[PDB]
């Protein structure tokens, strides 16, 4: 059963920290792909839930988090919650 | 074979159908008897 109210499993990632993390990743990718190119992050295009979501196990439970809120940006030359 | 309905909690929550309340006849210690079980399953673990 469920005691109390039903609430969705979720993950909290700091928005500013992730934005800085992606900025660093983009800089390093530009080193290989070109200083003047555009690096776009996007959600996984398809396949089993194991590969379209962030699969992990903590607390003894197996979580599948969307992550579409983390990889949805185009890089040209307070908190984020993942369902 | 499971006979499932939506969990349907008391409060409305835009997550209806994510958890199903499934009735089934499970085995028990003795092979001549079966036990009716009501279990909750996640939507992703069952197919119609």
């Amino acid at each position: 059963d469920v005691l109390g109210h039903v609430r969705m499993a979720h993950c909290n990632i700091s928005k500013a920290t992730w934005n800085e993390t992606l900025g660093k990743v983009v800089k390093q990718l530009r080193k290989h792909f070109g200083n003047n190119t555009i690096i776009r992050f996007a959600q996984s295009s398809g396949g089993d839930l194991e590969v379209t979501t962030h699969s992990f196990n903590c607390g003894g439970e197996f979580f599948y988090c969307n992550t579409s809120g983390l990889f949805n940006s185009t890089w040209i030359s307070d908190s984020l919650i993942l369902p | 074979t499971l006979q499932c309905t939506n969990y349907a909690p008391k409060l409305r929550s835009m997550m209806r159908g994510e958890i199903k309340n499934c009735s089934f006849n499970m085995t028990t210690e003795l092979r001549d008897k079966k036990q009716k079980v009501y279990s909750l399953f996640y939507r992703l673990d069952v197919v119609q």
Partner: antibody
Amino acid sequence: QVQLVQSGAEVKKPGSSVKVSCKASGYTFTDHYIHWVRQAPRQGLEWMGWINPYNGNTNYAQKFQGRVTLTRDTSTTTVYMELISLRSEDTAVYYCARGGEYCTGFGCFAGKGDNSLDVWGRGVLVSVS
Amino acid sequence: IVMIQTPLSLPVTPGEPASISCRSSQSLFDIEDETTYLEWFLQKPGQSPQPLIYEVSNRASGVPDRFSGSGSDTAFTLKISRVEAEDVGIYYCMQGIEYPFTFGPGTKV
């Protein structure tokens, strides 16, 4: 308890822009959609649109696309509707309502959509003349 | 858009039972959710509409037990065991299954 607080009244000339507030209290502001419904005098209820107070995504009835803009303030937990190009046929009481379904106990970051209106405010009468 | 009708807008006296009908041009039953999204409201004079029934038969909290209802396949009925002074106002039936939501003309008590 759960409340939506609206007050006052406004009178506008045709073509004017009016902002109608809806202050939320007693529940998590970001975990229910806020819907706007128009009620013309001596007429029935007409749905205008819905704003997601967490993301700011909105959806409007086809007749209101391009005329109604919804915004939010999550620090003040208030939803505002801005109406432009007011016409005589737009005289009505404008009600805000809280959806009956919660999105998630921690906010509207996921979900298919709402299906009901649980809490209604008193409404704001807007007249055009 | 789905059009909603509300037949039987009739005067009643105190203590009389009542029945208010609602008819939809399109079925309100969501196969995946296994529920019909029809919310009944009562708008008292001078007040905003308040919920009565959230899903055809599921009565809202705080609503007198005199209110009930049933139906399916677009045809729904709201029933009142006994009409009292607090039942005066306009009754509406929502079309929650799809956006935009519609309420129908409504009936008067």
